[PDB]
Amino acid sequence: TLSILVAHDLQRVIGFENQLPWHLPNDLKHVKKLSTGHTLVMGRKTFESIGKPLPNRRNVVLTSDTSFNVEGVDVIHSIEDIYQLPGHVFIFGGQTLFEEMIDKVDDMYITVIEGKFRGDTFFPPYTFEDWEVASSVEGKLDEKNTIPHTFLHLIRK
Ligand SMILES: NC(=O)c1ccc[n+]([C@@H]2O[C@H](COP(=O)([O-])OP(=O)(O)OC[C@H]3O[C@@H](n4cnc5c(N)ncnc54)[C@H](OP(=O)(O)O)[C@@H]3O)[C@@H](O)[C@H]2O)c1
Numbered sequence: 001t002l003s004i005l006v007a008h009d010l011q012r013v014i015g016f017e018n019q020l021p022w023h024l025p026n027d028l029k030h031v032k033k034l035s036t037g038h039t040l041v042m043g044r045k046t047f048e049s050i051g052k053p054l055p056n057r058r059n060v061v062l063t064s065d066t067s068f069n070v071e072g073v074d075v076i077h078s079i080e081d082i083y084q085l086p087g088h089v090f091i092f093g094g095q096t097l098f099e100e101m102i103d104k105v106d107d108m109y110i111t112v113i114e115g116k117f118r119g120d121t122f123f124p125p126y127t128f129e130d131w132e133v134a135s136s137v138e139g140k141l142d143e144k145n146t147i148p149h150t151f152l153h154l155i156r157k
């Protein structure tokens, strides 16, 4: 099972200057629930933006750097290596990896941020006539979660 896992805004912005443009704690909880116990695969720049591996799951980093080596991180050097990872594998980002994999994944867990942010990195365009809506759940707004957002589970038709 190969899935995308992404938060993107109304124009599909996912990042600005190596950071998330927005602060949404509920989306962090969403990611932890989905991916604890499984595998995250991310590009090198996504990994550097996080700083360190995320706990209690396998962290796989794709890079051409043969010197890359981080305690708690498994390194792969080819897209093809992804297809040798067991278990449930989530493509975690960023733009380059999403572009490489959106045509390969079985399904996508998208958090749509219902806002328009300045970005320099984007999720690729997709059309809902390629993807069925398995579920769509509005995120709950409160003091610490103040941007409207929707959790989609899209499965390839
Ligand atoms: N909103 C979200 O859900 C979310 C999630 C993740 C990331 N992001 C954002 O996305 C942005 C970063 O995305 P990005 O496109 O700049 O970078 P990226 O996709 O994270 O990383 C690109 C790097 O990955 C490696 N790579 C990609 N394909 C490869 C291949 N086929 N073989 C070997 N290595 C490969 C290369 O590393 P080397 O150059 O070292 O060889 C390349 O430089 C950040 O702003 C981050 O905040 C957002």
Ligand SMILES: CCc1nc(N)nc(N)c1C#C[C@@H](C)c1cc2c(c(-c3ccc(CC(=O)O)cc3)c1)OCO2
Pocket (backbone or CB within 6 Å): 005, 006, 007, 020, 027, 028, 029, 030, 031, 032, 033, 046, 049, 050, 054, 055, 092, 093, 109, 110, 111
């Ligand atoms: C949470 C944002 C997000 N949402 C969805 N829908 N899909 C994604 N791919 C990402 C992403 C991402 C990368 C860019 C990133 C950058 C960061 C982060 C975290 C992050 C930190 C803690 C958790 C909670 C956990 O799992 O323990 C989850 C994500 C993740 O924090 C520093 O900057």
